[PDB]
Design a protein around this ligand. Structure first.
Ligand code: PLS
Ligand code: PLS
Lengths: 394, 394
């Protein structure tokens, strides 16, 4: 019955207002492969809103690996990994990820999101604590809320705040710090050296979420711990397959006893169907390519360095990024929506960040690079972005 | 750092004990398609532990649809639906599901699990209530814990307990009842007529989780509301693609305003990458097949009716199932583990249910039918199950 439910949703007007004003640009229906250009409503649009940092969703080798796994294994495993849903190829990918990130063991999840839910819900319990960077990804916050622990946020990359908060806690309790590696909104990197120094002082476990780091930073893309040389000071390395690795799913890697505990105790792996064979095989093949072919990462960073320089040169105001995510400040929600739609209508796809996710005054568009972008494409997008910012009067 | 973390996991011994005793049968690595027989360690094993109720993960049409979507769209969409991760085929599948279950609108999630997290986390808030059947799926409990509401469990299919609990609540609050349609442990069906009668009395929203109902009950498999004729008294119909529909993902369908609210407010859709093209296309093609070819559902039920009769005839003690899930009581955890492994070693795959998920005295194995099972296969499995139950002295 719907009386009260109708009242709950009644105040949510922003989408109808966007649509009525002709500004709506969420759920844009793409008609083609995710690529440097996509087709929307039959037209070509430059894609600067993706997470496919290495451009690999179109790699024919990866497509063929996925198609071959469909031929061999079918369309789905129809059960949790725990029961009837494990394949030899899941175990192969676990072994290969473990080797890549330098850990004993790994457990796959059917999404990145569920990869965070798993360890955050089941390791810290009553009388324990989880310490979260305040800008951590929503899946981290949610995973932590599924624990029976006390969840404490600390100031973004604020090591004094982290230390202070840890200091106040009872000695006779377990603690686990979870942080994004690269934070996607502003594209900045966690201060992992200090964070791990503090963790070691207070015997706190460390978990890093490398969604946006894998295939981006670290040796041959192996992530944030790798980037800093701090493999031995990070207990759990979490990643996703939906970004550089061009697929769907994620994993948590760590010590075999911890991973064994997780795979038998995390609700998000015991009570959710396993990754499809196609996604296992595309992740396996992408992981090979990222390591074997250094040009992908190199070109991603050439593009990043070029675009960033070109944006700064044109007088855009960028956030403190250290990654291929280039946040461009606009500082007005209305303007952010207008710019986003005007760019769409002129063939450029960027992602808006607006209230209530951030304050109006920090609203921005996020311009992300892929290895497969050309300098010409970047130049066209920036040309158009200059014109639109003027039309919008930013 | 790992001192306290090591202590947290130190008491979890059951897996090492199972392994050391040669009883361990979780995460069994399958080497073939999910089918009525699977290959494990090079040997053939009858599969009676699956959720693929219609046997469709091996359907060449569905495989080819998935392979063709890989060719056209690549291996992944590399973003949330909200941003750059929507395809025309996602929208097509939403429209087709909406039509199938008789609702205005639907929103896809990349897993069934996340499909429950979405609406349960974001519709009821502070000062509201979610009422859950105590045997609801873990994803429902978790989704509800992600809300800012008060979560109340009621006794399993206990309409008096539901009514009483609703009665005590403030009038000036929203309420939402969420139930599994078919409950998978015992295979029983919710008392949706009474539940909806109560909901209507207290103006509570109703959400049904049809993971195990779609492709099983209802007209042409359209689920629990369909089975009872109660489409108009159920606000939200949730389903998964990982069972009958032979894929990965799920959906929530309902009124367009509610669905519009969800797709912009549920963290599990805004902050998680979209379904892979292959899984969209396999779900689309399976949904066509389920409707167009009535033989699948018919044969599933012929098998169910045959197996159930054959088990009862051999003196097995079954749970109160109304579905293709046949729970077979053993009532000893040790025996449940032994039986499970002995059957595995003799070429029969069943799923154990043990403490702490249930009391020792209600421990059981779950024997699930698929449309593609033959009577000969059922007979072989039951023959073997008689021998093992004797060897184990149940
Ligand atoms: C009633 C119900 N609701 C939701 C889900 C979650 O769906 P998913 O497995 O597609 O994520 C399941 C999963 N059920 C299986 C895994 O697919 C399990 O082993 O629990 C379910 O049974
Ligand atoms: C740091 C971090 N950790 C975890 C996840 C979840 O991974 P998933 O999208 O593969 O489920 C994301 C998702 N990030 C994207 C969707 O892929 C988003 O729009 O939020 C992430 O950025």
């Amino acid at each position: 019955s719907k009386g009260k439910l109708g009242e709950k949703i009644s105040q949510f007007k922003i989408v109808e207002e966007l649509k009525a004003k002709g500004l709506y640009a969420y759920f844009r229906p793409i008609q083609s492969k995710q690529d440097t250009e996509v087709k929307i409503d039959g037209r070509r649009v430059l894609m600067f809103g993706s997470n496919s940092y290495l451009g690999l969703t179109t790699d024919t080798r990866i497509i063929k690996a996925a198609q071959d796994a469909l031929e061999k294994y079918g369309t789905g495993c129809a059960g949790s990994r725990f029961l009837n849903g494990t394949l030899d190829i899941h175990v192969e990918l676990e072994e290969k990820l473990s080797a890549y990130v330098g850990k004993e063991a790994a457990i796959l999840f059917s999404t990145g999101f569920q990869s965070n839910l798993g360890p955050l819900s089941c390791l810290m319990g009553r009388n324990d604590y989880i310490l979260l960077d305040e800008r951590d990804h929503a899946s981290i916050i949610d995973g932590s809320r599924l624990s029976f622990s006390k969840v404490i946020k600390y100031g973004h990359n604020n090591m004094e705040d982290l230390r202070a908060k840890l200091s106040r806690l009872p000695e006779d309790s377990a603690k686990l710090i979870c942080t994004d590696g690269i934070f996607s909104m502003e594209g900045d990197i966690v201060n992992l050296p200090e964070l791990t120094s503090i963790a070691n002082e207070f015997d706190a476990a460390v978990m890093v979420d490398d969604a946006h780091s894998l295939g981006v930073i670290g040796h041959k893309g192996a992530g944030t711990a790798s980037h800093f040389g701090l493999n031995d000071d990070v207990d759990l390395i979490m990643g996703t397959f939906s970004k550089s690795l061009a697929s769907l799913g994620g994993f948590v890697a760590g010590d075999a006893d911890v991973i064994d505990f997780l795979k038998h105790n995390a609700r998000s792996v015991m009570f959710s169907a396993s990754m499809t064979p196609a996604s296992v095989a595309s992740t396996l093949k992408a992981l090979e390519i990222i390591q074997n072919e250094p040009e992908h990462i190199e070109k991603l960073w050439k593009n990043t360095d070029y675009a960033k320089a070109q944006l700064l040169d044109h007088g855009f105001d960028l956030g403190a990024t250290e990654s291929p995510i280039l946040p461009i400040f606009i500082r007005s929600n209305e303007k952010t929506f207008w710019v986003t739609k005007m760019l769409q209508d002129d063939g450029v796809f960027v992602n808006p960040v607006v209230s209530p996710a951030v304050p109006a005054e920090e609203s921005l568009i996020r311009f992300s690079l892929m290895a497969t972008h050309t300098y010409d494409q970047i130049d066209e997008a920036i040309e158009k972005m200059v014109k639109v910012f003027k039309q919008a009067e930013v």
